[PDB]
């Protein structure tokens, strides 16, 4: 029996007539993969694929809505000009950027090769969500024992704890999770840096060996557990003064 299978073929019917190593043509399954597994929390939308068939050029307008931070997601809108045969991207332009990502995307999108731009935007959204999750975890761990508050527009966490040794002097720790978008310089991906800063009564510790300690603990325990152990070391001397 000879059967013709297309993009709308049933999964069971495709597995009936599968004897090649080519990927499955069930296009609902392909888009389910593309939406749920490789790029979750991204509401892509295409609304106009009109063409100028005299020139053989396809005009595509798509909207990328990075909805990982569902409270205030940032969205972008591209415009691509295809060649539709001997495929060359003659021109691409950015139609609209959400204002809450407009500066970082303005520095990033100034360079060409929009594939790097899309991957960098998705990676920056993912890394910012990871930053918010890590900071929320540390806040929930240290909400009641210490005083937790975010500043530098939620890029630095300040944890303060008074200590016994004097007339109740305070020990405050600042941990940073600054995220940098590559505009001037060594690749296209959005980078992230972690550094700590410790104060006891208003006197800054030496940043060299403190950064050595931060590097060692993060290298040993990862990021979440590493930052937890940095907080435990730099906030609770009485627990470790045996």
């Amino acid at each position: 029996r000879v059967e013709r299978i297309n993009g709308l073929t049933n999964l069971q019917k495709e597995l009936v007539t599968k004897y090649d190593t080519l990927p499955l043509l069930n296009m609902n399954l392909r888009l389910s993969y593309l939406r749920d597994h490789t790029y979750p929390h991204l509401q892509v939308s295409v609304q106009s694929r009109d063409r100028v068939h005299n020139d053989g050029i396809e005009v595509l307008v798509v909207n990328y809505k990075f909805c990982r931070n569902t409270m205030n997601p940032f969205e972008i809108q591209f415009k691509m000009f295809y060649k539709f045969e001997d495929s060359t991207l003659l021109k691409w332009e950015i139609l609209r950027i959400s204002t809450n990502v407009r500066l970082k995307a303005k520095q990033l999108l100034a360079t060409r090769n929009f594939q790097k731009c899309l991957l960098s935007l998705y990676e920056f959204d993912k890394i910012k969500s990871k930053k918010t999750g890590i900071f929320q975890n540390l806040i929930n761990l240290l909400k009641r024992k210490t005083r937790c508050y975010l500043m530098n527009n939620s890029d630095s966490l300040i944890v303060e704890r008074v200590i016994r040794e004097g007339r109740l002097t305070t020990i405050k720790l600042q941990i940073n999770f600054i995220i940098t978008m590559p505009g001037e310089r060594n690749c296209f991906l959005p980078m992230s840096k972690i550094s700590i800063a410790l104060w006891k009564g208003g006197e800054r510790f030496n940043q060299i060996d403190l950064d050595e300690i931060c590097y060692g603990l993060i290298k040993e325990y990862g990021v979440k557990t590493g930052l937890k152990e940095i907080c435990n070391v730099c906030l609770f001397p009485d627990m470790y003064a045996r």
Partner: peptide, 20 residues
């Protein structure tokens, strides 16, 4: 017990600041 100690130190700070 760390939570209780932090609350106690906050109370010490309260009575210290309300004092002269």
């Amino acid at each position: 017990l760390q939570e209780e100690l932090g609350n106690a130190y906050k109370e010490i700070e309260y009575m210290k600041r309300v004092l002269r």
